[PDB]
Design a protein around this ligand. Sequence first.
Ligand code: SF4
Ligand SMILES: [O]
Length: 753
Amino acid sequence: RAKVAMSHFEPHEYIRYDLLEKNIDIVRKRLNRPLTLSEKIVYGHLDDPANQEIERGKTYLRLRPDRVAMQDATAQMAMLQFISSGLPKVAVPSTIHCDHLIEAQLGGEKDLRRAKDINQEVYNFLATAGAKYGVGFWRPGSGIIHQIILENYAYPGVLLIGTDSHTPNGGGLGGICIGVGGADAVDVMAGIPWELKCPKVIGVKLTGSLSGWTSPKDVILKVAGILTVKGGTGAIVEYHGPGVDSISCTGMATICNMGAEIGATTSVFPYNHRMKKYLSKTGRADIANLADEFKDHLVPDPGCHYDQVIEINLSELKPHINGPFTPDLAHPVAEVGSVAEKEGWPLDIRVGLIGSCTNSSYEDMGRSAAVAKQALAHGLKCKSQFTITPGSEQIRATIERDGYAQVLRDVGGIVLANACGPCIGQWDRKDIKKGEKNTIVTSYNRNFTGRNDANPETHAFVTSPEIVTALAIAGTLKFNPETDFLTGKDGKKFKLEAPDADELPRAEFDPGQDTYQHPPKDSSGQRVDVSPTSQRLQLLEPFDKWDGKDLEDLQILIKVKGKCTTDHISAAGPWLKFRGHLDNISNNLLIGAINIENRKANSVRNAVTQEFGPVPDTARYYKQHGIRWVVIGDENYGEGASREHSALEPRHLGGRAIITKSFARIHETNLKKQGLLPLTFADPADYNKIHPVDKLTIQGLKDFAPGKPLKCIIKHPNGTQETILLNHTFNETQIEWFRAGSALNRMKELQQK
Ligand code: SF4
Ligand SMILES: [O]
């Protein structure tokens, strides 16, 4: 057909819209119905289109992804597991992005300089492993992984998996981009079929057009409030409707990005002209031209069935701000000042932060700059502290050039390195003591306890870049930009005009400096050195095979009550320093979960010594003494981030099974990958029948089978037993992972030794 290349760095890897078409076709003959946009792109990528059992929400699809992307906080451990496989080269186009380890303190190029010193050991590891197995490397400073992917690797009809839960951002350019854990990326780097549970499809119909202060963020802040953090589990959100064409291409990225906060498998928009337009401005107009030739397969079939439909009228949606400690608690910016007052949330804003992969684009910076110059014209500057993060070198270089970075600096903002920064708590923040109650408003996406500054009493609210700027100029949550009046230097009252700005540079993009480094695909005769006395990197030892017997007399490490995020299971911020060292990082295991016994964080009773103390230390004592343990959890356990450390770390400290009401998808797949048993209650009221002092026997592991549940004998200390039933979603692929010890120990047996 045509020979159009996947990117500017892989001139020999072509887009295969001919193969997408071939398979879409084979499949709609078996099914005889309209296919939605995500069914087309997902099923066009099946390993066996003719024989694959397709049932939404029931069957497991064996898929073939087109490329793998890694950020440096999860790449370390994906590559250390790749090194253990023994495979010589990655089998699909893969990238490493160094965005997570650059701490905010001084601003801009000072922090970058300091990050390169402090973390050299790590960047060195990734760079060398990169050159050796054929993975491209984007150096520190390059940008946040999702801006670099939308700018360079994302295209209509791509199936891309990334080791980061915000990978759905790519749906803004018509692809299926799905977040996974390091062991899932190893399968595809190694050449085996990837499995995904067939999703349901929620359709959102957009209507009207966005006006004034309303922007792309408000649509996903309202869908999160409506569907809640557990609403999208097991479904792809498919956007459609007449109002789609009024949203920019980076606006659509904003909305697919934050679909992660409702647990969606991903989100996607259909190929339209705003996408075409953006591909051409990012030098990929040949791709724009080929997607027009394949257009029918990049839009939904007429009359397709959604399992749920929601409709939003863009012309009626007004500004929103979500939180304080969940992103689905939605308020409008018009009563947030009253609900905080009533609810005892701090009213004065200490810091305002625009950035992160959800809101770091040229359009976001320009709409921001436009509230900022109105304030400047009347001689005002920020009452709050103001920080600004650019999405990539290219956005940074271009907003510098078009004048926006200096308006943002003249109102009183500091520009930080092109990196996550304060968003995974890599902030050296010093305006508050620890435990001081305060309010910070961000244009980010999550606002979980202690996530931005390790201070559990920080009240964080998420909103849009232009509203964070209005509220930072004012310093108070009691300020509606639409109604109220500021006071200038002049002596007069003025009101803010709604921001206006271009979706993309009038000129072409200024690309900044060279941050990419291609694999030498010649040399590769590098050794990767991991110091044997290193505190940041450590090679892995395999886990044990299953013994062939049931799990009698299991100790309960903790029964968790309430919300339990992977930011609670394995904290980030200062702990990012140990993302290549399993033993050292295992010392944050569960320190933020609330124990039901005493309502406290990191304080559990050691069964033997009967003293109360830290969760990691009690799990090490149980492991030292031979006691096999379990965790008991509530609903939507493992919510949030995709980091596999939350499943590797209970395996290293002796954990055996985790039992909950429900699981979040990516954490449940990561638990089965590492040899653990994720199990749910067949009746959720049984959670109330298990007390912290009971012992549990999981039984019938010997004839473990898909569809057949497991029995759990709850041994109460008085001599009262009780049998309850536990369901699992394992298919037979997955049961071989468990019997072997981990997915990786299974993969190594298959290499004929
Ligand atoms: S959500 Fe924050 S930490 Fe996770 S990728 Fe986006 S900017 Fe980086
Ligand atoms: O993320």
